[PDB]
Design an enzyme around this catalytic site. Structure first.
Site, PDB file in Angstrom:
ATOM      1  CG  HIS A  61     -79.062  69.935  27.199  1.00 53.98           C
ATOM      2  ND1 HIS A  61     -78.863  68.595  27.998  1.00 53.98           N
ATOM      3  CD2 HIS A  61     -78.491  70.882  27.656  1.00 53.98           C
ATOM      4  CE1 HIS A  61     -77.586  68.946  28.501  1.00 53.98           C
ATOM      5  NE2 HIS A  61     -77.495  70.270  28.233  1.00 53.98           N
ATOM      6  CG  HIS A  91     -87.121  75.502  25.339  1.00 52.52           C
ATOM      7  ND1 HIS A  91     -87.139  76.513  26.382  1.00 52.52           N
ATOM      8  CD2 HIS A  91     -87.730  74.215  25.977  1.00 52.52           C
ATOM      9  CE1 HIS A  91     -87.528  75.839  27.471  1.00 52.52           C
ATOM     10  NE2 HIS A  91     -87.907  74.600  27.367  1.00 52.52           N
ATOM     11  CG  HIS A  93     -89.246  69.742  26.213  1.00 54.58           C
ATOM     12  ND1 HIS A  93     -88.117  69.744  27.061  1.00 54.58           N
ATOM     13  CD2 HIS A  93     -89.663  70.973  26.491  1.00 54.58           C
ATOM     14  CE1 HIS A  93     -87.864  70.500  27.689  1.00 54.58           C
ATOM     15  NE2 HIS A  93     -88.759  71.481  27.376  1.00 54.58           N
ATOM     16  CD  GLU A 103     -90.305  68.834  29.422  1.00 50.93           C
ATOM     17  OE1 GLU A 103     -90.355  69.756  29.718  1.00 50.93           O
ATOM     18  OE2 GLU A 103     -89.119  68.070  29.641  1.00 50.93           O
ATOM     19  CG  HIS A 116     -91.520  74.416  28.022  1.00 57.77           C
ATOM     20  ND1 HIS A 116     -90.638  73.466  28.409  1.00 57.77           N
ATOM     21  CD2 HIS A 116     -93.075  73.809  28.011  1.00 57.77           C
ATOM     22  CE1 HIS A 116     -91.712  72.357  28.956  1.00 57.77           C
ATOM     23  NE2 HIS A 116     -92.818  72.925  28.587  1.00 57.77           N
ATOM     24  CB  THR A 195     -88.944  70.536  32.657  1.00 57.17           C
ATOM     25  OG1 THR A 195     -88.508  70.840  31.519  1.00 57.17           O
ATOM     26  CG2 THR A 195     -90.157  70.834  33.104  1.00 57.17           C
TER      27      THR A 195
END
Ligand SMILES: [Zn+2]
EC number: 4.2.1.1
Length: 257
Positions: A61, A91, A93, A103, A116, A195
């Site tokens: 992911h 990590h 996004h 996000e 994050h 999230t």
């Protein structure tokens, strides 16, 4: 099972994870005009000098940069927080295009990516116990925009070839997360959730106002990762972001005027 596709993406998560429709979900849109300056909020204390990075993992992911959290080596304190929170991993996004990826949003603006840095409250002893508590985690969120390169990111970018596919890991020692921080620690804060599944409502969110700049070449390397495992049909790891969720009965507070 869950992921970011048409058939298994964020709009489907509620079937396996009903808290997806809960009262304190993340991320949210930060409406800068309605966020309240709170003079009682303290400066954040980010103490990362003794950080011990260990490993980088493609988990299907995102990729996680993991730290030794068996002692108080890299900790977050102050700001809205009571007590001490230990860094376990960071990590990102990111999007398929520079116009999406974050996000959180700011007055509905999407950034190209969002970092994050995930920390757990030492009063609960381990991460797995902390996520069962309303004050178990503190996540420091940092926006990425595309412009100049971020020198402190390049060691991350350069190891991604070694972890292209789901389940791959590589040694990642001696990485200094201080090189991912902007100049200012001004922030917004609100109570929310993970999230990703299991979407537990255990997070104090601390979102920095100032984005960092990364180069187009840096973010292009993120988009060469794969969601799939080795030897399976190639699916580029892009658009691994959950959209903004309803704010419900919450107040976003600002540390700055
Ligand atoms: Zn995240």
């Amino acid at each position: 099972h869950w992921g970011y596709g048409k058939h298994n993406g964020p709009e489907h998560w509620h079937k396996d994870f009903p808290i997806a429709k809960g009262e304190r979900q993340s991320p949210v849109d930060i409406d800068t005009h309605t966020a309240k300056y709170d003079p009682s909020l303290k400066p954040l204390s980010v103490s990362y000098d003794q950080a011990t990075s260990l490993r980088i993992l493609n988990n299907g992911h995102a990729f996680n940069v993991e730290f030794d959290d068996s002692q108080d080596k890299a900790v977050l304190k102050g700001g809205p927080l009571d007590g001490t929170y230990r860094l376990i991993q960071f990590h990102f996004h990111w999007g398929s295009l520079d116009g999406q990826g974050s996000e959180h949003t700011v007055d509905k603006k999407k950034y190209a990516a969002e970092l994050h840095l995930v920390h757990w409250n030492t009063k609960y002893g381990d991460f797995g116990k902390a996520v069962q508590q309303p004050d178990g985690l503190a996540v420091l969120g940092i926006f990425l925009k595309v412009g100049s390169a971020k020198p402190g990111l390049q060691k991350v970018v350069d190891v991604l070839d070694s972890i292209k596919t789901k389940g791959k890991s590589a040694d990642f020692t001696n990485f200094d997360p201080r090189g991912l921080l902007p100049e200012s620690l001004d922030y917004w804060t609100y109570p929310g959730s993970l999230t990703t599944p299991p979407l537990l409502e255990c997070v104090t969110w601390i979102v920095l106002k100032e984005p960092i700049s990364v180069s187009s070449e840096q973010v292009l390397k993120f988009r060469k990762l794969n969601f799939n495992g080795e030897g399976e049909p190639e699916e580029l790891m892009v658009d691994n972001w959950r959209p903004a969720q309803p704010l419900k009965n919450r107040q976003i507070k600002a540390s700055f005027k």
